[PDB]
Amino acid sequence: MEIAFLLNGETRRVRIEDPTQSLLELLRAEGLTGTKEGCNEGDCGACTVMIRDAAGSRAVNACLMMLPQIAGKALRTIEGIAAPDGRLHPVQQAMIDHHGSQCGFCTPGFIVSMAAAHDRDRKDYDDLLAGNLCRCTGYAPILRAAEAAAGEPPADWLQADAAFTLPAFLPETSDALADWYLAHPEATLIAGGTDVSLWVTKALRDLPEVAFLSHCKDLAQIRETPDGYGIGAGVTIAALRAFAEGPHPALAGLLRRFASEQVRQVATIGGNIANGSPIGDGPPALIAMGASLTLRRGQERRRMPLEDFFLEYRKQDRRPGEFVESVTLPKSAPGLRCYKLSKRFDQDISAVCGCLNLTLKGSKIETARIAFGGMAGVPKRAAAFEAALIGQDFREDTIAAALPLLAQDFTPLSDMRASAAYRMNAAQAMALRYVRELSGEAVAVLEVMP
């Protein structure tokens, strides 16, 4: 199998024999030593690279990216950020001028991130750089450099790659996929690959029988429906976040702290769901908002409410040959509020994630959808707590009196991110937080300005 892609401006054709190899290794073995390996796990940003296709350009982690994923794309690494004639990119010069590096090792990945952001004129730095770690400089000088570079015309030589392209299975339509998977029920489906590549890099596993979903444009669509929005399984967390900013700001704010920008640009919602982790951040949120999920096997098509997909820790309502095809969201849900709690705010895994949605009949509680991740072997509503809530008045003291029912709903575990007492106590606090918030009170540490 042969794929083609543009590499720092030059066309390249490669014979893939191991579809699972990561981009980061291919590059280092080709001698493009500028892309560094800092964790090999998606967390540090040091291997950041820039890809570009028709949706535009984005920075992603080369260590999480397998080669088949870049077919037909244009790839830029740190060695290609400068112009052909040696001119430094504005972001490069600014990093020199502002002392944005000391040891140098995180430098290339910061430069690639910064370059990609400049390319699309994006200025939300804290979020664009969350996933580039630097142990030396304290970050401030890198902010100064991004800020000085923003006032500089985009590099022309980077934009010119836009003009490009204009064994291991690579489906182009949902139909082709559906067919093939039905025949190879045991296959390994790879979407963004952000959960799967850790089976190969860290567990040192080996996956035969593999299919890449990233090239089914039809699996990655957001469609307006009569009663909601239909979100394809292949829609990335970044794309879902962008869409939600309007109709579901609370889900949007949540996805802000989902992994890093780098991961968000290739991880998929379908994937977050299929991975079935009780600490996924997607599922709780979607459950509180009452979304539904659509499975698919050949031409068949099931359709339960999202929460019903998860049975037990590590086990889902999924049939041989069946895959996740999309999820559907209501057009609205203004009661939704999503809370994520971890050791660090950015790029961390939740100790506890709580999503709350209460509907009101003036002062009275009509409906209550309350979901938690990390409090159990599986994302789940807090039935006893929800139930005791209906009909009661929406004041802090009534919620206060119902809290113990959460200890009936969940028996949380202790681990390295947090102790059971703490997770319990925090599930409870999320409830208090919710009333206080809706009741117009100051509650979020992240919104306090100096």
């Binding site: 590096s101 090792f105 142990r135 304290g138 660090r344 540490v445």
Partner: protein, 760 residues
């Protein structure tokens, strides 16, 4: 060129991805890749060891065991040995047992996992308490230093605070991980490695191969971060590549994967600190008794000098008439702890800052005035001494903190905060000032030496080389500036070369913030020799005196004529004047006795102070740093831009240490936090939103290179103010002592909030 804010020598290569780190060096195609098989037991005898499945693994070429080590099996930086491969038993989960060399880094990791080992387990010692109960320790018993009579002083004290508190360790998290490469070179070896202490690699590799030091050469061009984590942990990888390369006849490389890096190497020592401290009615301190428990891990490593340095800083920034410290260095079956930015300093100092905070709350006094009252006296009969009896003749804390408090708007801001908290029931803001006094010089005195070697080529360009290693602190730009200032030419004519034991010998680790202090002097010593030669030569030629030959800005001037430095150099070459010189420097005035705890272990003290403002969420503990203001004393900085750069980065790393960074081991002793996804250093947005850093510009009283001060480690202690600030916020939630512990993660802050609130 000194004093100018010039960029790092390699800024351009960093930014275009051209700078090479160890794993980027091109190597021959027949290069082997290695990996260690690790112990899965915290403490056990090895009873069986089947490596057959290892040898059969694909791509494997050789596997090694302690029995295969041809000579020394010892990587320790101290007298007591520390095997590189386990000799019959294991002492922590992660101790290397055997060694695989394969034709690729993956093939090696994979084979490393396939051995069948049987063990005979033994009870393991994993907590301070256990180690104390078992009398598990180093130095056969505690180390006590006493000045005056504390018990007496405490018994008669108007005010008193007793308290105990944990301080967690910290993982270095250098972005480039441990790594080395060894190339057989007829008879000897060449080692390239990523180490702050190439002479020690030299030493250790020599002993492992059976060779005199002159058959082993070690080069090191640059590290992607060190922070102390590479002062000695470089020894294992280097010894393994050399031994593998003697055995297979081929170049061998080893680099750790992050997970292994974190499981095998050491970390800042975590401490338990018990204190009693008392004061006068007016506020002057009367005494302070401290007990320090330090968790050192399974082998001594650098625990000795680390613990001593903690003891040396138990006074914080304050003069204390009576003071006692009892320091236990406890051995446990875990990672062998080691150097980390600050080297004991911060634990010792944090000890005293907590105490004095407690005391202050106790007497209902504002912590800042209590502190300001007890700083050492300014300079200029009988000067105050520290509890180890070293005169403190340079303390500017008084003047400094006052100036910080005002530029930072402290008083007003303290009031705004009270008011704001009184209107809020879910969030609380905190603000705190913390000072720093950090002694400079290694405490094992003979380490305070440095050399250099300078060469001038006949076109006038210059090659500079010295014993320090560059790990991002700007050592190489500073030395270039020194050289360009002393020789009277523009920096661009001066090129730095890789640290290399065959060029400057017997160097000390770059550490203890002594890299620029000492190598700058050595470099100046070598340039002055050269410049002496050149003046001698221009004088005789133009008949005048040497002191009247003038080098400045690339020109040479004498008797009314002038020439370009290059013409002078070419003429000296034709006149046959040697253009090569070495340089050396030994820090003066040091002398002290460890066992007695008396003398002058430091040449001088670096000072600074930080005021930090934070907010916390009383419901979950979530929190963050809103603003930080710093004033730090780097003497007459050799490069203020690189200095501001160290202060900011160290501030962030100290606060990291006392907030999100947490190490956790399970019941069996396995490290549970061993990857960036579970061990969390500060991320981009944890940076303070308002971040003001200024330098206190006053020349050093001591004769240091251009009157500068080391600025590498001192400023890491400024992060204590962030922790003190989180504590201020907790205290604002109730009348009780929050007893906030370190690291103050959100779980920990919450627990403190609740104590304060009286909710248990």
């Amino acid at each position: 060129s000194v004093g100018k804010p010039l960029p790092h020598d390699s800024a351009r290569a960093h930014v275009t991805g051209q700078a090479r780190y160890l794993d980027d060096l091109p190597c021959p195609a027949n290069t082997l890749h290695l990996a260690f098989g690790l112990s899965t037991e915290a403490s056990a005898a090895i009873t069986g060891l089947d490596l057959e499945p290892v040898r059969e693994s694909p791509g494997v070429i050789a596997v090694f065991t302690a029995a295969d080590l041809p000579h020394d099996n010892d990587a320790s930086p101290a007298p007591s040995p520390e095997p590189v491969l386990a000799t019959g038993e294991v002492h922590f989960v992660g101790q290397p047992i055997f060694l695989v060399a394969a034709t690729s880094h993956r093939a090696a990791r994979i084979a490393a996992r396939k051995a069948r080992i049987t063990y005979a387990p033994r009870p393991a010692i994993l907590t301070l308490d256990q180690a104390l109960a078992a009398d598990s320790r180093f130095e056969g018993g505690p180390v006590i230093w006493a000045r005056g009579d504390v018990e007496t002083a405490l018994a008669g004290a108007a005010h008193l605070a007793e308290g105990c508190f944990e301080i967690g360790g910290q993982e270095h998290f250098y972005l480039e991980g441990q790594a080395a490469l060894a190339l057989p070179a007829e008879g000897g070896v060449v080692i390239h490695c990523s180490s702050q202490h190439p002479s020690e690699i030299q030493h250790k590799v020599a002993h492992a191969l059976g060779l005199a030091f002159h058959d082993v050469r070690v080069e090191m061009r640059r590290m992607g971060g060190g922070f102390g984590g590479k002062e000695s942990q470089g020894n294992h990888l280097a010894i393994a590549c050399a031994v593998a390369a003697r055995a297979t006849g081929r170049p061998c490389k080893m680099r750790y994967d992050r997970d292994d890096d974190m499981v095998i190497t050491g970390k800042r020592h975590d401490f338990r600190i018990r204190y009693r401290i008392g004061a006068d009615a007016s506020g002057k301190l009367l005494g302070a008794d401290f007990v320090h428990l330090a968790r050192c891990g399974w082998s001594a490593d650098l625990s000795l000098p680390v613990c001593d340095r903690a003891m040396l800083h138990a006074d914080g920034s304050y003069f204390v008439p009576a003071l006692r410290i009892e320091s236990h260095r406890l051995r446990t079956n875990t990672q062998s702890n080691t150097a980390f930015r600050g080297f004991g300093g911060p634990q010792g100092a944090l000890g005293m800052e907590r105490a004095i905070e407690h005391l202050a709350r106790g007497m209902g006094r504002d912590p800042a005035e209590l502190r300001a009252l007890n700083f050492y006296d300014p300079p200029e009969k009988k000067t105050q001494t520290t509890h180890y009896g070293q005169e403190v003749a340079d303390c500017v804390l008084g003047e400094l903190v006052t100036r910080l408090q005002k530029s930072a708007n402290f008083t007003t801001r303290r009031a705004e905060i009270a008011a704001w908290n009184s209107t809020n029931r879910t969030l609380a803001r905190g603000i705190a000032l913390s000072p720093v006094k950090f002694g400079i010089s290694f405490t094992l005195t003979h380490l305070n030496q440095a050399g250099a070697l300078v060469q001038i080529y006949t076109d006038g360009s210059v090659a500079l080389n010295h014993g320090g290693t560059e790990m991002g602190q700007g050592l190489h730009a500073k030395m270039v500036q020194v050289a360009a200032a002393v020789l009277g030419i523009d920096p661009v004519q001066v090129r730095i070369t890789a640290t290399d034991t065959s060029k400057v010998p017997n160097t000390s680790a770059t550490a203890a913030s002594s890299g620029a202090d000492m190598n700058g002097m050595a470099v100046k010593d070598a340039c002055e020799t050269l410049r002496g030669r050149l003046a001698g030569f221009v004088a005789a030629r133009e008949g005048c005196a040497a002191r009247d030959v003038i080098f400045d800005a690339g020109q040479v001037q004498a008797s009314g004529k002038s020439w370009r430095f290059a013409e002078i150099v070419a003429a000296a070459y034709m006149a046959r004047i040697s253009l090569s010189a070495t340089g050396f420097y030994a820090t003066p005035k040091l002398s002290w006795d460890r066992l007695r705890g008396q003398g002058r272990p430091f040449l001088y003290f670096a000072y600074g102070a930080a005021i930090t403002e934070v907010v916390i969420d009383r419901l979950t503990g979530e929190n963050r740093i809103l603003r930080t203001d710093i004033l730090h004393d780097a003497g007459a900085s050799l490069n203020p831009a690189l200095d501001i750069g160290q202060i900011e980065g160290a501030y962030v790393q100290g606060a990291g240490w006392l907030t999100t960074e947490e190490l956790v081991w399970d019941h069996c002793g396995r490290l549970m936090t061993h990857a960036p996804s579970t061990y969390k250093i500060p991320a981009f947005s944890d940076r303070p939103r308002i971040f003001n850093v200024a330098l206190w510009d006053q020349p050093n009283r001591e004769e240091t290179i251009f009157r500068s001060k080391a600025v590498g480690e001192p400023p890491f202690l400024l992060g204590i103010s962030a922790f003190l600030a989180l504590h201020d916020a907790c205290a604002a939630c109730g009348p009780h002592w929050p007893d906030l512990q370190a690291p103050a993660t959100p779980e920990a802050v919450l627990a403190a909030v609740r104590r304060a609130e009286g909710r248990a």
